[PDB]
Design an enzyme around this catalytic site. Structure first.
Site, mmCIF file in Angstrom:
data_model
loop_
_atom_site.group_PDB
_atom_site.id
_atom_site.type_symbol
_atom_site.label_atom_id
_atom_site.label_comp_id
_atom_site.label_asym_id
_atom_site.label_seq_id
_atom_site.Cartn_x
_atom_site.Cartn_y
_atom_site.Cartn_z
ATOM 1 C CG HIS A 61 -0.291 0.180 2.514
ATOM 2 N ND1 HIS A 61 0.391 -0.859 3.121
ATOM 3 C CD2 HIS A 61 -0.218 1.239 3.370
ATOM 4 C CE1 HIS A 61 0.859 -0.453 4.295
ATOM 5 N NE2 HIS A 61 0.509 0.817 4.461
ATOM 6 C CG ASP A 69 0.982 5.268 4.593
ATOM 7 O OD1 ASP A 69 0.555 4.124 4.857
ATOM 8 O OD2 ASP A 69 2.117 5.668 4.906
ATOM 9 C CG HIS A 93 4.775 1.144 3.596
ATOM 10 N ND1 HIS A 93 4.348 2.352 3.064
ATOM 11 C CD2 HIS A 93 4.125 0.989 4.769
ATOM 12 C CE1 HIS A 93 3.417 2.852 3.865
ATOM 13 N NE2 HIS A 93 3.298 2.067 4.914
ATOM 14 N NE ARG A 142 1.307 6.313 11.474
ATOM 15 C CZ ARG A 142 0.308 5.549 11.057
ATOM 16 N NH1 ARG A 142 0.528 4.449 10.346
ATOM 17 N NH2 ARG A 142 -0.939 5.894 11.357
HETATM 18 O O1 LIG Z 1 4.359 -1.423 11.063
HETATM 19 C C1 LIG Z 1 4.896 -1.237 9.987
HETATM 20 O O2 LIG Z 1 6.072 -1.682 9.684
HETATM 21 C C2 LIG Z 1 4.261 -0.470 8.865
HETATM 22 C C3 LIG Z 1 2.970 0.203 9.286
HETATM 23 C C4 LIG Z 1 2.427 1.110 8.231
HETATM 24 O O3 LIG Z 1 1.897 0.640 7.222
HETATM 25 C C5 LIG Z 1 2.541 2.659 8.455
HETATM 26 O O4 LIG Z 1 3.125 3.033 9.556
HETATM 27 O O5 LIG Z 1 2.081 3.445 7.644
HETATM 28 FE FE LIG Z 2 1.384 2.326 5.913
#
Ligand SMILES: O=C(O)CCC(=O)C(=O)O
Ligand SMILES: [Fe+2]
Ligand SMILES: O=C(O)CCC(=O)C(=O)O
Ligand SMILES: O=C(O)CCC(=O)C(=O)O
Ligand SMILES: O=C(O)CCC(=O)C(=O)O
Ligand SMILES: [Fe+2]
Ligand SMILES: [Fe+2]
Ligand SMILES: [Fe+2]
Ligand code: NA
Ligand code: NA
Lengths: 282, 283, 279, 277
Positions: free
Chosen positions: D90, D92, D226, D240
Site C-alpha cells: 500500500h 498511505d 510498503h 508515528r
Molecule cells: O508497522 C509497519 O512496519 C508499517 C505500518 C504502516 O503501514 C505505516 O506506519 O504506515
Molecule cells: Fe502504511
C-alpha cells in the site's frame, strides 16, 4: 528441540535464516562443526561473516564434512570441487537446486568474494512453513501426489519424479518439494489442473512471511539446506559479482506412496494451457 | 450498408453467422455468387445446407471465384489437389485463425462435413471486429500501434510472421483484432511478461459468447468463412468418425497502422520468466 | 416424440409435443427425457394457456411466488423475465444462496429478436467427471458457502461441492460463478484458486449447449445439475414467462474436514484484483 | 556528513552518525537530500528521542496529522500497536484527495526477529515498463477508495505522478487502496492493475528492513509502497508522525472516463470470495 548455545546467533526473520558470530571456518573443530550443523537444521540457511581468505583446502574439507562434493560451470584453478558463480560468466527465479535430477544436492556453501556494496541479495524460503500453511484438505491432497521436474537445454536433458511433500530425513518434518524453476507438472492430475495448483503453491510458498533476504558483504559465507528451501538471486546490479561455491551431493526426496496412478491422456490428447506464455524467449 | 435481399437468410447470433436457404451451389450463377460474397462480408461465416453431391469441379470453381486455392502435405480427392480431406482419425480444441504464423495466411475456407454424428463436433466462430470495437478507447489506441509475432514449431513445419495487432479488412475498411490463442506468440513492442498479460485478456475477451456463434453440422452442410476477421474453435466432444472436404483460399496480407514504437530490446543474458505456470511437458 | 440432441453434453429439442393438454403418460416421457438430457426444448407452443402452464409446472412440484420480479396479471406463479423491465450474462445455477434452491424451471420466450439472446446450459455431471481422480476425491469431501447481499435480499447457504442427483444417483459439481462465495474447509485464497479453475473448466464448450429462441419455444431444465448463461448481445425487446419449481435439498458426502478457522484479526487479501466499485 | 549504507540498489539507506534530538538545520538538509535519493532512510540508535524533538523534526517536512491513540499532550505522535495489522502492499491514504507526503516511524517495542517492513520504488516500477505501456499509463487516472465503518473516502489520482521536487515520474497505484482505472472498463482495469501490482513489487524494486530498538524509518509516501510482514505474535508498538499535504499531479488524461450503459453489470474475470473472515 535442537539446542544451539555455543555461538552468538542473530536470526534474520521468524521463518528462517541466522547469522552466526564467533566462528572461524579456517581451522574449525569437530565440535564447532557439529554446532553449525545443528544450526543449519534449525535455521535452514546460516550466514558466517568475515571469512575473507578462507583457503581452498579448508573450504573443500568443510564441504566434505557434509558429504561428497560435486564436480560441475567454471571451477577454481586447481580445484574442480570449487565452482565459480560469476556475473560476467545470475538466477532471478525461485528454485531448489537441480531438482530435475533423481538425487539433487543436499546443500551448498557459497561465499561472495567480490560484489557491490548494495545489489545482488539472495533470498531463501522455508518449505516447511509453505506446507504447514496450507489448510488440512490441501495438505492431505498433496501428501499423495508426485511431480515431474525437468530441464531440456543443449548438453543437459534430465527429468525426475519426486513427492510433492517430502520428509526431511534428519528432522522428520514435512516440507513442500516443488519450485517454479524446475517443477514441470503434478503426475496424477491433468496438466491444466496441475498448472492451477502449482501456480497457487509457487506464489504461496514464497510469501514474505516464509522468506529471508540476505545482503552480501565480502567475506560472508552462506550455507543452506537444499532439501527444505528455495532461493532466488536478485538481479538488481550491474557491477561484477563473483562467488565460490561447493555443492554437497546426495539427496533422495522421499514421502508418502502416491494415492493415485499417473493421469493417462487419451491418444491424440492435446495440452492447451489456460494461461498464456510466449512461444519465444529473448 | 451491404444489401443482401436475394435469398432467405437466417442469422445465428447477433455477432455473426447466417444460414442461407434457396441456394444451389452446383451451378450457381455469377449474380447469385456476388450475393453470397456480400453475405460473407456482412456475416463473416455463412452456412449453406443441403448441398450433398456437390461436384468436385464445381467446388473448385466456386473457391476460385474468391482467389487462388491451396494445394498440398495432406490427403486430397483423386485428381483434385485443391480439395483437402479432413479426418478426425488423422484435432485440437483451441481458438485460432488459420495459419497466422505465415506472412500470407488464407483469406478464407469452404468446408463441408461429409461424415459425422448427429450431435457432437460443433464449430464456433468469433467476430474480431466486435472484439476490437468492444475494447475501451485507450486500449484500442494502444493496440493500433502494436504488432505481434505468430509462430509454429512442429516436426516438418517451422514458420513465423509479424502482423499488426489490429488489421483493416481490405474490402470493408473496418478494423479487427488480429491475435489468436493458437498461433500468436507475443506482442513485439512490449516485454514478454507485459505481452502475456495483455494477450491473456484479449484472448478471453475476444471469444466472449456475445461475439461468437456455434454451428451444429448436418450432412450436406457447407461453411464458408472469412479468415481475415474471425477465429474459430472445433469442439472436442465426440468419438465417432468425422470427415470433411475443404478448399482453402490463399492470399491475405494483414495490414494496419505503422507501429508507434520500436521492438522491445532485451539486455544481454536477460531471461523470460513467465508470471503464469505452463507445464514443461505436454502429452 | 422426435428427439433431436443439441450437443453430446446435454440438451435436446422435442417435436410432436402439445403441452396444452398433455397426457400423464406423455408427461412421464418428458420427465424421462429431462433426466437424460438435463435441458429440453419444446418448440411451437404459442398460445399455451396460463392455467395449463401452471398445471404443467405443478406436475414437478410446488411453484415459486416471486416477490421482486413482475408476474403475469392474475397469476402470481407465472414470473416475467423482461429485458425492458430488468438479463443475466453470468454463469449461474438458480438461487443456490438459498438452503433449498429450485429443482428446475419452465421458461418460454414469447417475444424476442430473430437473433440474439441465446441461452447456454452446462452439464455439471461432466464437469465433475472430467476432473482427475485426486481432485474428485478432494471435492467429494468439501462444502461451499453460497450467498447474496443486496437491498431487500440477504441469504446464504452451505451446500456440498459435489451433489448426488436424487433420481439418477449420479454426482455433479455444485458450484457456480454467480452465487458461490468460497469453499468452507479451505482458506479463502486456496478457495479462490480452486473455484477459479472449476468455474472455467465446468463451462468448457465440450460441456455446454447454446439455444436460439424462437417465439413459442419452451425450455425445461433441471437446476440440480446444470448452470446456464443468458447471452447479452441484443437491444430488442425480449420477454419470457417462467414458472420455477421449488424443493431442492442438495445432498452430498459428509465433509471430511472441519471449516477453516482464521485467527483473530486475520485478513483476507485476494491474490487477484477485483475493482472496489461496480458501475 | 554521515555514514550512509544503502540496503538495496533500488532504495533504502541506513544513516549512521546522526543524533535527531538536537539535529542542526544543515544536518537536516543532508537527511532531506538523502530521503530524495533513497526514498526511505533508517536512523538507528535513537532511543529516548524526546516528543518535542520528534514533533519539530516532522514539522520540518510539513504539517502533521492530528487525528488512533497518541502520546499524552501530543496528538501528532500516534501510537501503533499490533494488539490494537494487514500484510498488503500500500501507499498511505491514497483514497484521500491529499494523501500524506511521508511518515516518521519508530518501533519502541518488538521482537528481535519478525515484523520486517518492506518498501518498493515506484520510480523504477514505472521506468521498468516498456515504452508503449508508459505512454498509455501517462494518460490514465485511477479511483482509490475505502469503505469501512466510520470511513468512506474516494479520490481520483493520476496513474503516473510527477514528484514535485525531483521531477521524476512514479507509478501511483497500489493494491490496498486503488480500485480501478477510470478510462478503461472494469475488466480491462483488473487485468492491467493485476500486472502492475505484481511488477511494481518485484524484489529488484524493493528493500526489506529488520527493526531494532531505537530505529527510526522516514519514507517518502509520494513514490513508495510498503508492506508489513505478518510473521510474528509478540507485542509490537511504534510511535508515528504523519506529514500531510500531497497533491498527486500528472498529465491531463488523454481519454474520458469509461461510461457503462444502463443496467450494465461488472462480472470480474477472476474470483474473489464474497465473505472475508
Ligand atoms: O508497522 C509497519 O512496519 C508499517 C505500518 C504502516 O503501514 C505505516 O506506519 O504506515
Ligand atoms: Fe502504511
Ligand atoms: O548468486 C547467488 O546468490 C545464489 C546462486 C544460486 O542460485 C546457487 O549458488 O545455487
Ligand atoms: O473441423 C472444424 O469444424 C474446423 C476445423 C478447422 O479448424 C479448419 O478447417 O480450418
Ligand atoms: O433469459 C434466459 O434465457 C434465462 C434467464 C434465467 O437465468 C432464468 O430464467 O432463470
Ligand atoms: Fe541455486
Ligand atoms: Fe481452422
Ligand atoms: Fe437463471
Ligand atoms: Na480449463
Ligand atoms: Na511480473
Amino acid at each position: 528441540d535442537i539446542i544451539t548455545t555455543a555461538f552468538e546467533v542473530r536470526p534474520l526473520t521468524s521463518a528462517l535464516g541466522a547469522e552466526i558470530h564467533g566462528v572461524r571456518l579456517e581451522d574449525i573443530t569437530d565440535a564447532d562443526f557439529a554446532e553449525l550443523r545443528r544450526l543449519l537444521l534449525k535455521h535452514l540457511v546460516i550466514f558466517i561473516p568475515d571469512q575473507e581468505g578462507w583457503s581452498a583446502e579448508s573450504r573443500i574439507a568443510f564441504g566434505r564434512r557434509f558429504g561428497e562434493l560435486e564436480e560441475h560451470l567454471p571451477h577454481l584453478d586447481g580445484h574442480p570441487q570449487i565452482q565459480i558463480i560469476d556475473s560476467e560468466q545470475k538466477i532471478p527465479i525461485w528454485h531448489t537446486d537441480m531438482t530435475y535430477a533423481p538425487n539433487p544436492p543436499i546443500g551448498s556453501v557459497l561465499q561472495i568474494v567480490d560484489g557491490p556494496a548494495q545489489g545482488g541479495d539472495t533470498m531463501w524460503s522455508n518449505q516447511y512453513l509453505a506446507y504447514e500453511g496450507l489448510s488440512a484438505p490441501l495438505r492431505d491432497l498433496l501428501d499423495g501426489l508426485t511431480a515431474v521436474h525437468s530441464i531440456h537445454i543443449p548438453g543437459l536433458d534430465s527429468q525426475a519424479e519426486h513427492p510433492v511433500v517430502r520428509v526431511h530425513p534428519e528432522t522428520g518434518r514435512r516440507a513442500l518439494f516443488v519450485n517454479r524453476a524446475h517443477t514441470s507438472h503434478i503426475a496424477q492430475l491433468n496438466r491444466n489442473e496441475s498448472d492451477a495448483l502449482l501456480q497457487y503453491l509457487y506464489r504461496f510458498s514464497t510469501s514474505p512471511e516464509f522468506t529471508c533476504r540476505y545482503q552480501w558483504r565480502p567475506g560472508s559465507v552462506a550455507i543452506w539446506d537444499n532439501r527444505v528451501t528455495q532461493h532466488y538471486a536478485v538481479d538488481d546490479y550491474s557491477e561484477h559479482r563473483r562467488g565460490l561455491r561447493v555443492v554437497v551431493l546426495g539427496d533422495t526426496p522421499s514421502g508418502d506412496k502416491p494415492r493415485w496412478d499417473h493421469y493417462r491422456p487419451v491418444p491424440g490428447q492435446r495440452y492447451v494451457p489456460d494461461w498464456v506464455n510466449a512461444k519465444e524467449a529473448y
